[PDB]
Amino acid sequence: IVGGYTCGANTVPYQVSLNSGYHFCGGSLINSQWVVSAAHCYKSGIQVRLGEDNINVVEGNEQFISASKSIVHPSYNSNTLNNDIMLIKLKSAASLNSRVASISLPTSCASAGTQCLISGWGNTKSSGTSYPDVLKCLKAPILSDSSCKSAYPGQITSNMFCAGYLEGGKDSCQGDSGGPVVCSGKLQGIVSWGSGCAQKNKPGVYTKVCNYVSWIKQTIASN
Numbered sequence: 641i642v643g644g645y646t647c648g649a650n651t652v653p654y655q656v657s658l659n660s661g662y663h664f665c666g667g668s669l670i671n672s673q674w675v676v677s678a679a680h681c682y683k684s685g686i687q688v689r690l691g692e693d694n695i696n697v698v699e700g701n702e703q704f705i706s707a708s709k710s711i712v713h714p715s716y717n718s719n720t721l722n723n724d725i726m727l728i729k730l731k732s733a734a735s736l737n738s739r740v741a742s743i744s745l746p747t748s749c750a751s752a753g754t755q756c757l758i759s760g761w762g763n764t765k766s767s768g769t770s771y772p773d774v775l776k777c778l779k780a781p782i783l784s785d786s787s788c789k790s791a792y793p794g795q796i797t798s799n800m801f802c803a804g805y806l807e808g809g810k811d812s813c814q815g816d817s818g819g820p821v822v823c824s825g826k827l828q829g830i831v832s833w834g835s836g837c838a839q840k841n842k843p844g845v846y847t848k849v850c851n852y853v854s855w856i857k858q859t860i861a862s863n
């Protein structure tokens with residue numbers, strides 16, 4: 641997260657870290673067994689880390705649970721990033737408590753102008769590199785479809801939205817991938833892509849979660 645703030649320990653209780661020896665992506669806990677992330681975060685050997693603040697220090701609220709199954713969306717295209725979503729099942733159910741909690745799925749799509757919370761352990765600089773140990777947060781609005789399309793001609797599908805600031809300075813970034821965009825207590829986005837981070841006229845692009853709720857539910861119901 642570039643241009644954000646320290647969230648505070650365990651204040652984003654659905655935020656998980658995907659770990660394969662190291663943090664490499666965020667995700668969102670959506671029930672005791674299942675995590676939402678980005679399909680471009682797929683790999684084998686994932687351990688889900690819940691209850692994290694400092695991802696380098698064991699602070700006392702973590703739960704570490706290995707994935708049993710990954711399901712990338714059936715229509716994910718890794719060239720266009722269309723349908724950039726996957727589900728990860730945990731080998732055992734997480735213990736749910738104030739610091740480890742699921743985030744509700746949307747029952748309707750959010751509109752441009754809605755305020756959201758984006759979070760992660762990704763890069764905090766727009767030039768150069770610095771990775772935080774504690775969770776960072778950013779409040780950002782959803783941008784109109786038309787400004788998203790004009791920012792990224794030919795590349796925004798109906799499964800994507802832009803959020804952030806056309807002026808630059810505040811955005812998600814590499815290592816935030818797969819993490820939440822939460823708006824009024826519903827998971828509306830997943831950190832997906834952009835051109836650089838926090839550049840002028842290049843806002844972040846996010847998977848439009850409300851298009852996937854019936855796929856999510858039917859997948860969970862059968863797996």
Ligand SMILES: NCc1csc2ccccc12
Pocket residue numbers: 811812813814815816817831832833834835836837838843844845
């Ligand atoms: N908002 C931009 C963004 C999000 S994840 C990622 C990974 C690499 C480069 C940019 C980004």
Ligand SMILES: [Ca+2]
Pocket residue numbers: 692693694695696697698699702
């Ligand atoms: Ca920790």
